[model samples]
Target: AECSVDIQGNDQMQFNTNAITVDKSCKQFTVNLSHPGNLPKNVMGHNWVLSTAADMQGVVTDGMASGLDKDYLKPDDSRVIAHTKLIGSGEKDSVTFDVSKLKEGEQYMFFCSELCGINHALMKGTLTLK
Candidate 1:
């Protein structure tokens, strides 16, 4: 997967990949997310939300207020670069965005938008554009 990656979110509230690297030659990049557990969206939902490393906390804070109907994200929030729909067990979602949106040397992060579970806060990873 030179320009894309597949990540998994399980009932354990964990993501299979801890970091992603986008090659400079790519014009667009994709993130494929899947949940393998057997829980419903309301309980163990997972979504892929991306933002600058600095913007993550803000996005999560506002997302908490936006509610699940909005995919646990603030609609039209300028801070969000891209995201996938909230999903649960046996479900999958993907997101693709122009790689130009990313700046060289900038650090980014992705995480679940939903409260997910007791460990939801720890469900996150880093992304780097090189």
Candidate 2:
């Protein structure tokens, strides 16, 4: 079965929904992101980054300092499980990763690491493989 998902980011620094499910039947999973906001990326940039539930904060912290040229992620940083490029209004990006890399019952965290707004801290979600 094809395993893929679509998510939307907005000017409010919000995702349309905040959770995703990865079916175990697929060898790999794909995620597509779209930004519906009207602002430029630097003003309301958004991205999807994945990592262990515990590693998210540190990853975000390090990524925050990396700047946007690297898509807001530390270069060659093994701590990042997966990620998409920074996007803005009417922009989109996709990423695919091996499903086997995710262990059953392990909760993965996905979030927008950009300082999208004063409330950018809440732009995060969860993913699960059941």
Candidate 3:
């Protein structure tokens, strides 16, 4: 009966959930992102970006260049399969992507695009198509 999942981003830039599975039969997959910290957006913002494992670095690099106003993501980036809006404390954002976007054997990764903290490296998760 579950059609979506919830994930939390903390002040440390760590995501509470590290891995997720998508049912192959799902018409769409949704990720609900929330930030529990009290910091403001500039100080501590978070977003969820979904891309292939091989595309992570490049996608993130371009995303950072796009800046916060753009939700820390490149405008109309095709490499990004899905993403949530940048959110601060007590705010939530979600992104749903068509299940057809996923490939059977490819690996997908979810990461925070915020550039303010060391834990950004740790704020990563994997998504698998099942």
Candidate 4:
């Protein structure tokens, strides 16, 4: 019954969890991202973007060009498996993807697409299915 996770991003440009595990039994998985700090979306916004490990950097690079209008992600980006819209302080967003898209032993990655701040680079994590 446990098929979702809640992660937080604060003004510090960090996510509460550095890694996440998805249960193989779940038919689908959900990621709920929340920003509890008091900052505007333009300054410290956060969004969750998920993709394979090898595509993480590329997604981030292209996401930078996509900008806030597009939630910092390229439109119809095939590299992106699932993602949530950008959100600000006190705001929250969620994204769900099918478990079938994941391979048990494959490497997965998640990150904030927003160019939040100087430490935006640190707002990333690993994911695995088990």
**Top TM-score model:** 1
Give per-model TM-scores: 0.96, 0.92, 0.93, 0.95
lDDT of candidate 4 over 6-89, digit per residue (tens) = 999999998999999999999999998999889989989988999999998888778769867887788989999899888999
* Candidate 1 residue-wise lDDT, 22-61, digit = tens: 8879999999999987998888999999999999989988
What is the per-residue lDDT of model 3 for residues 3-121, given as tens digits with 9 covering 90 to 100?
A: 58899998878788899888898999889899997987788888888999999988888877987788778888999998888888999998888999998889999888777587777
Clashing pairs in 1: none
lDDT (Cα, 0-100) at 114 in candidate 2: 76
A best-first ranking of the candidates according to their TM-score comes to: 1, 4, 3, 2
Tell me the tens digit of each residue's lDDT in model 2 across 24-126: 9988999999999699898899989888888887887777689677766788778778889889999999999999878887989999877788868778889
For candidate 3, the per-residue lDDT at 5 reads 89
Cα lDDT for residue 23, model 3? 86
C-alpha lDDT score of every prediction, in listed order: 0.90, 0.85, 0.86, 0.90
- List where candidate 4 sits over 4 angstroms from the true fold: none
Better of 2 and 4 by TM-score: 4
C-alpha RMSD values across all candidates? 0.9, 1.5, 1.2, 1.1
Candidate 1: which stretches are off by over 4 Å? none
In candidate 3 the C-alpha lDDT for residue 97 amounts to 87
TM-score of model 4 vs. true structure: 0.95
